[PDB]
């Protein structure tokens, strides 16, 4: 079991790094892929890449060895880098939802409203918020619990548990996950709602001659919308539920499960290349990039 658990982590890192390198390559190397949407995809892929290179590997060791080998400074920097890259990833998924909703439902308004320079500000904002929730609290010790047993792990350099106070775990969870999850629901719900109301206007048009049914395109669009919300939710909702649970009755949920769910969340970063880069132009670039 601990033989196969370790091998599994390895390919997680392989899938993340490969996938996100392949994406960033494709976008930078293809004139046709440098669209406005793919600008936000580039932000996403950067976040997930840093997850694959630095965040997951150092985390993989802490499971294998059962202790932190690189001393108190790097514990806190790695922790910041983790929170930063997760926050950027998830908040960027949320920006993409918004973007696509506008470009599908108000395409002409969206072209004038959403300039390339406006997109850059949105992107930079997302990383600023991600920094200010991770690096600023974590490096400045605002996250720290006052407990004695918590203060033992802070003084031990072999211990790199992420024990936070009440306030930080609430705020950090809301900012990194819950606000984005609500936005992503609201927004993608108005895509479903818009498409259903549009089919009503088509049946009203017919003067009772036809009633429309879900065709190939409509089932496929609903499957996509499901994958987007399903995979994201599956991957991060368990961890972020449990993270809020620990703020109340910390004994209730085991530590091995808390960590197991944090790995499920890292796995999202391997999924995002697969979900968000299926365009015919991406497919062409990927084959060109693999000689």
């Amino acid at each position, epitope marked *: 079991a601990a033989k196969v658990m370790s091998l599994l982590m390895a390919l997680v890192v392989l899938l993340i790094v490969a996938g996100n390198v392949l994406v960033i390559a494709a976008i930078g190397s293809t004139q046709r892929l440098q669209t406005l949407t793919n600008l936000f995809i580039t932000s996403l892929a950067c976040a997930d890449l840093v997850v694959g290179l630095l965040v997951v590997p150092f985390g993989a060791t802490l499971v294998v060895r059962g202790t932190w080998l690189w001393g108190s400074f790097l514990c806190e920097l790695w922790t910041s880098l983790d929170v930063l890259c997760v926050t950027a990833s998830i908040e960027t998924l949320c920006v993409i939802a918004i973007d696509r909703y506008l470009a599908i439902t*108000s*395409p*002409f308004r969206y072209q004038s409203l959403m300039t390339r320079a406006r997109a850059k500000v949105i992107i930079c904002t997302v990383w600023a918020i991600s920094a200010l929730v991770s690096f600023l609290p974590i490096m400045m010790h605002w996250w720290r619990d006052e407990d004695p047993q918590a203060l033992k792990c802070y003084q031990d350099p072999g211990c790199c548990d992420f024990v936070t106070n009440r306030a930080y775990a609430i705020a950090s969870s809301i900012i990194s996950f819950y606000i984005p999850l609500l936005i992503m629901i609201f927004v993608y719900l108005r895509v479903y709602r*818009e498409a259903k109301e*549009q089919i009503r206007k088509i049946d009203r048009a017919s003067k009772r001659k036809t009633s429309r049914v879900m065709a190939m*395109k409509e089932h496929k669009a609903l499957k*996509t919308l499901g994958i*987007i919300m399903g995979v994201f939710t599956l991957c991060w909702l368990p961890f972020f539920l449990v993270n809020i649970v620990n703020v109340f009755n910390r004994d209730l949920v085991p530590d091995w499960l808390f960590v197991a769910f944090n790995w499920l969340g890292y796995a999202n970063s391997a999924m995002n290349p697969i979900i968000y880069c299926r*365009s015919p132009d991406f497919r062409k670039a990927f084959k060109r990039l693999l000689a």
Partner: nanobody
Amino acid sequence: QVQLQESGGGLVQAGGSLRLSCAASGSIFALNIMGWYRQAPGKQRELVAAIHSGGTTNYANSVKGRFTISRDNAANTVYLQMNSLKPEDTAVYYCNVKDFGAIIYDYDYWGQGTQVTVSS
């Protein structure tokens, strides 16, 4: 299979009128843009007019006020009513459907094209 069937073009006197029509047969996602582009001889293809499933429109400057785009509420069919034609408007006109059914990206369908020639 999706296919776009263009009609209504041809030859016409300057100051006259034409009514292009493009009938999109096949599965198209409810949310989309049907449009008309054109390509005058030895030039690049440009947008003439476009209409979202929603009802919003978008025109080029050259044709603003003269041309009006509309769509059949029932079927996937789009009409470009071209009035006050000038020799400048002479081009191969292409019907286009931007399909949004993939959500993250759009799929494009183009028509074969139909000649419009406006003599003075």
